[PDB]
Design an enzyme around this catalytic site. Structure first.
Site, PDB file in Angstrom:
ATOM      1  N   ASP A  40      -4.976   2.316   3.510  1.00 52.06           N
ATOM      2  CA  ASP A  40      -4.435   2.110   2.131  1.00 52.06           C
ATOM      3  C   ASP A  40      -4.009   3.767   1.672  1.00 52.06           C
ATOM      4  OD1 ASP A  40      -4.340   1.166  -0.631  1.00 52.06           O
ATOM      5  OD2 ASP A  40      -6.340   1.186  -0.908  1.00 52.06           O
ATOM      6  N   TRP A  85      -4.665   7.023  -9.969  1.00 51.71           N
ATOM      7  CA  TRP A  85      -4.209   6.758  -8.728  1.00 51.71           C
ATOM      8  C   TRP A  85      -3.262   5.540  -8.256  1.00 51.71           C
ATOM      9  CZ3 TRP A  85      -5.052  10.537  -4.732  1.00 51.71           C
ATOM     10  CH2 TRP A  85      -5.636  11.584  -5.308  1.00 51.71           C
ATOM     11  N   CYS A 144       0.863  -1.235  -0.055  1.00 51.34           N
ATOM     12  CA  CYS A 144      -0.101   0.170   0.241  1.00 51.34           C
ATOM     13  C   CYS A 144       0.960   1.435   0.061  1.00 51.34           C
ATOM     14  CB  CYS A 144      -1.001   0.015   1.283  1.00 51.34           C
ATOM     15  SG  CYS A 144      -1.558  -1.812   2.366  1.00 51.34           S
ATOM     16  N   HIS A 161      -1.323   2.454  -6.539  1.00 49.91           N
ATOM     17  CA  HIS A 161      -1.477   1.791  -5.170  1.00 49.91           C
ATOM     18  C   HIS A 161      -1.052   0.206  -5.221  1.00 49.91           C
ATOM     19  CE1 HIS A 161      -5.759   0.398  -5.958  1.00 49.91           C
ATOM     20  NE2 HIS A 161      -5.671   1.207  -6.516  1.00 49.91           N
TER      21      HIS A 161
END
Length: 354
Positions: free
Chosen positions: A278, A295, A87, A297
């Site tokens: 997260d 985004w 994460c 991750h």
């Protein structure tokens, strides 16, 4: 909605392991070096998100994001180690620092909260604490919070533009904030807002900012987390949320992240656990439509030969990101700084590899 564990088919052991590693500094493995001449395998987005195994992500990152003063470089052993944490790893590598989350923004509709708490009613079978936690959660607006961070970041960027020392940056920043009647103007000299630039380790480094604000760029990432982290208070707040925790100050949208301790939501049913946080890397994309931004991750820490499996890095459109999970009832949009000479926050980010 669905938990992180339900979504990714993580077991109780998986969740405990993720939480244990995330609260520290099936063992975590550092992915090996990828030669610069090894091109990434193609992969493509599906339903708003692209994902690839971490080894392949390293290849892509090396081709595009690795650039320093325009020139590619291998992701270093230390960077691969950071990345392997899951994460948090993407954000850690791209910013060059473990996320402090000191300067953080959110948007909360106080009027909707007050109204639903008075005029609304707990759902059939819902406890008091569950009701209050849910209404607080629904009263945040992540799109507006992200937009606030972007607006403040653009203000901060304009302030550093032709500023060659911190005092000049601060002077530009204050004049800019005054002119726009922004409540941020009145933050204390030692506040997270005003201290964010000088707090950035790369700002001081000869090879980074070299104490010159104009050498830096504001960048944004997001943390999703749990509001009810006080293990000394009621079990109800731990399982259902603390309606009064992590709310943005009405004037400024600033969230006080000092009480965030990386503690996950308490299980509401035995056996079914929650992950603590997260992190999602935005960077500094120019795209004006929030819903078109990407985004980045990782799903969890790298365990290629264990139960958890290899880390996979996801590149999600903003709506995919803001959807969140039952694990998290808070989102913060964090601002920090990196040297302009880096390329970890480019103007355009593309999902996948052709």
């Amino acid at each position: 909605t669905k938990s992180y564990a339900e979504t990714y088919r993580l077991t109780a052991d998986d969740v405990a392991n993720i939480n244990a590693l995330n609260e520290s500094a099936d063992d975590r493995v550092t992915p090996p070096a990828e030669p610069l001449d090894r091109m990434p395998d193609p992969y493509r987005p599906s339903y708003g998100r692209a994902e690839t195994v971490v080894n392949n992500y390293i290849r892509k990152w090396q081709q595009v994001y690795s650039h320093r003063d325009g020139r590619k470089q291998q992701m270093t052993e230390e960077q691969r180690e950071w990345l392997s944490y899951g994460c948090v790893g993407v954000t850690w590598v791209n910013s060059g620092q473990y996320p402090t989350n000191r300067l953080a923004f959110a948007s909360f509709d106080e009027d909707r909260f007050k109204n639903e708490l008075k005029n609304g009613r707990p759902r059939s079978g819902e406890t008091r604490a569950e009701f209050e936690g849910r209404v607080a959660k629904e009263s945040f607006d992540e799109e507006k919070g992200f937009q606030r961070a972007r607006e403040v970041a653009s203000v901060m960027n304009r302030a550093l533009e032709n500023a060659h020392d911190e005092s000049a940056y601060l002077d530009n920043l204050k004049k800019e904030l005054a002119n726009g009647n922004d409540a941020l103007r009145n933050e204390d000299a030692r506040s997270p807002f005003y201290s964010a630039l000088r707090n950035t380790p790369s700002f001081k480094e000869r090879n980074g900012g070299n104490h010159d604000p104009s050498r830096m760029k504001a960048v944004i990432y997001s943390k999703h987390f749990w509001s009810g982290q006080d293990r000394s208070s009621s079990a109800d707040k731990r399982k259902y949320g603390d309606p009064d925790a992590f709310r943005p100050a009405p004037g400024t949208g600033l969230v006080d992240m000092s009480r965030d301790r990386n503690i996950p939501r308490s299980p509401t049913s035995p056996g079914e656990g929650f992950v603590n946080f997260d992190y999602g890397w935005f960077g500094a994309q120019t795209e004006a439509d929030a819903d078109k931004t990407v985004w980045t991750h990782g799903n969890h820490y790298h365990a290629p030969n264990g139960s958890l499996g290899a880390m996979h890095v996801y590149e999600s459109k903003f709506r995919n990101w803001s959807e969140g999970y039952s694990d998290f009832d808070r989102g913060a949009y964090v601002i920090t700084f990196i040297p302009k000479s880096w390329n970890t926050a480019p103007d355009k980010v593309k999902q996948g590899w052709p």
